[PDB]
Design a protein around this nucleic acid. Structure first.
Lengths: 95, 79, 75, 98, 105, 72
DNA sequence: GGGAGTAATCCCCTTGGCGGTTAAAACGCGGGGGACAGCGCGTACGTGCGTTTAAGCGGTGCTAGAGCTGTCTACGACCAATTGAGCGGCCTCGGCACCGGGATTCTCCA
DNA sequence: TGGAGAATCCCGGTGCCGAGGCCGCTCAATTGGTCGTAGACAGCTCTAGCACCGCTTAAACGCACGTACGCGCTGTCCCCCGCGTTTTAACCGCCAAGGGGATTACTCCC
């Protein structure tokens, strides 16, 4: 049989990191898999034309942060850029 | 024609789902005409990019692509 | 243009001060702002013209003006 | 015999249909409808059931949206009854038809 | 050993990285950019599943149907801002009645 | 400070005839001022974002082209 | 030097046809309350003219941030080997809706 | 305005099928070294936006004032609405002809 990549296990351990005793059916997992896929190619879209509008052929994270501040409004954007900032600092401070 | 299979109590049920309190009998022909407009638009785009893939069986995936060129895409079908 | 220039640059600068301090503006970009905003507000007034005519009225008021903003859906 | 007043029945209907989520239009008339419509462009077009139900759910989304816009436009027009002139006005102000 | 363990992250960096590479957006890429993008992903999906669990405790259900997700996305003004452009398969509509349509007696 | 009243009401009434509306009530003007202020606050936020990422501190023509073509 | 058309194949997928049946489409009909024509009104709103005021455009300083370049050096592609994260067949027991029927709660007019 | 009547709800009992683990497999992330490279940083240029100001001015503003029609109220009537009745085609499902998307190799082209 063929192989298909899936994100059931990943958001699965995310939700058991957050919600201990809650089950989820197949339809909600499918619509959120399509959601995370859709937000992936769209934000790859803004990353692409911020790269090419700034005459750049290289993706750097600064463009991705800029892309998410250009689309996502409000204080949720500030929380997202904050948690991502701590994520990339604990990435760069790793051994 | 098979548009008479879209019955008027189904239109009543979907209008009560759609939030309409009081319904007259003159909306059905307008609804069917605009249904022709949107549905032949979507199916011409879907069969166009179905035959762009050189296949003859129409699945839901290129349907989701034809919806996401419109800007009101539909989730849960690998999109 | 019929809306006047220098209070439009002044108001755009004043609002941009709430976003980031001390920006400098090219003239042509502000002209692009002016012509685009003129286009959208003209469009919304034939929208309100059709709203008022369909409401069997000749004078518009902000209640009718807002229902059009929920027709487009912005807030 | 007992006969309920109109409007309370509509209130119960709008509550039980905004509570519900099931597809109310039958699948076989819509299936033969899209078969006949697909026969117009090219012959022998074959549909998966997933595409049919996805287009069906999309049709529910657009019709419920335009019904709610119709309702807000009609109560904006100081009426409870709906008329087709509201349909052409709601389709023009949406910008879907120029 | 994996970069997910060293990053303190939980979504796969390599899978989204190879999705970037076969996505042919540009030629060269940074290192922490998919880490940032993945971190934004579990933040946003964690907020969505938190609101889904909130709806689950609201309607006495422990197994989540997308009713929970539609109630979660359509009561928040930010989620109505971001996902008002997008429809939902098996979405449905909230109970909303006008003031005049109420039986004013 | 306080330059929302700079949009004069005869300029709005010229916007009403080129918008084609025959008669205007007095309550229209501050509503339209609020709508244009909301839309301008929306677009200048993107303009500041394009200015900040481009390692510059002024707004140019391609920035406003992108900011106006993003929403359609 | 790897993308692309060409050839069997097959087993899962498409379409449908026929028997039963069953809640639903649609029609019939009294009806009554909201759509809608008609009058009073009064008020806000259109227009018109004195007054002012910011305004339209020129003139100059100027400098400092945009625009272009040298370069080289850290930084990304990429390629041989590995393995454990992460794909799938299988099994099981519990979440949840169905059946049903009494407690609970709108509805109207006498 | 309260009771007859009917919709709703919720709990006792129930069956079912799929959510989630269990184990087998397997192949792209991972290690690490190398080498092309392109943009980070420093540096030279340059030019026009901003600031300030003055001559002259089209337009805004605000009150006076006449009145047109949106709204309130009255009266009408008719048109789908609730209830009852009658056909009806949608759907289970079982089978079945067959069809074709993807799976292998074979060989060609810019």
């Amino acid at each position: 049989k063929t192989r298909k990549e899936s994100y059931a296990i990943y958001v699965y351990k995310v939700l058991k990191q957050v919600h201990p005793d809650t089950g989820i059916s197949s339809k909600a997992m499918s619509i959120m898999n399509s959601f995370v896929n859709d937000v992936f190619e769209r934000i790859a879209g803004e990353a692409s034309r911020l790269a090419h509008y700034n005459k750049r052929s290289t993706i750097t994270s600064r463009e991705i942060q800029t892309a998410v501040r250009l689309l996502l409004p409000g204080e949720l954007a500030k929380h997202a850029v904050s948690e991502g900032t701590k994520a990339v600092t604990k990435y760069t401070s790793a051994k | 024609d098979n548009i008479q299979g879209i019955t008027k109590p189904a239109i009543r049920r979907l209008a009560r789902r759609g939030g309409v309190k009081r319904i007259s009998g003159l909306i059905y022909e307008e609804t069917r005409g605009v249904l022709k407009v949107f549905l032949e638009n979507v199916i011409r785009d879907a069969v166009t990019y179905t035959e762009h893939a050189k296949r003859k069986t129409v699945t839901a995936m290129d349907v989701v692509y034809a919806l996401k060129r419109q800007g009101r895409t539909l989730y849960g079908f690998g999109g | 243009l019929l809306i006047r220039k220098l209070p439009f640059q002044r108001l755009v600068r004043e609002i941009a001060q709430d976003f980031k301090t001390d920006l400098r503006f090219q003239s042509s970009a502000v002209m692009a702002l002016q012509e685009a905003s003129e286009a959208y507000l003209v469009a919304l007034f034939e929208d309100t013209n059709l709203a008022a005519i369909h409401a069997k009225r000749v004078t518009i008021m902000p209640k009718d003006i807002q229902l059009a903003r929920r027709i487009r859906g912005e807030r | 015999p007992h006969r309920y007043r109109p409007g309370t029945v509509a209130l119960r209907e709008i509550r039980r249909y905004q509570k519900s989520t099931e597809l109310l239009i039958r699948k076989l008339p819509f299936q033969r409808l899209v078969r006949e419509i697909a026969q117009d462009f090219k012959t022998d077009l074959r549909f998966q059931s997933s595409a049919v139900m996805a287009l069906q759910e999309a049709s529910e989304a657009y019709l419920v949206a335009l019904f709610e816009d119709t309702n807000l436009a009609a109560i904006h027009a100081k009426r409870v009854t709906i008329m087709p002139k509201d349909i052409q006005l709601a389709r023009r102000i949406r910008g879907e038809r120029a | 050993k994996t970069r997910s363990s060293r990053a303190g992250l939980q979504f796969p960096v390599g899978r989204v990285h190879r999705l970037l590479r076969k996505g042919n957006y540009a030629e060269r890429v940074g290192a922490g950019a998919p880490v940032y993008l993945a971190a934004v992903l579990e933040y946003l999906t964690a907020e969505i599943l938190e609101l889904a669990g909130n709806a689950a405790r609201d309607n006495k259900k422990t197994r989540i149907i997308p009713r929970h997700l539609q109630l979660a996305v359509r009561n928040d003004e930010e989620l109505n801002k971001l996902l008002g452009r997008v429809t939902i398969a098996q979405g449905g509509v909230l109970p909303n009645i006008q003031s005049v349509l109420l039986p004013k007696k």
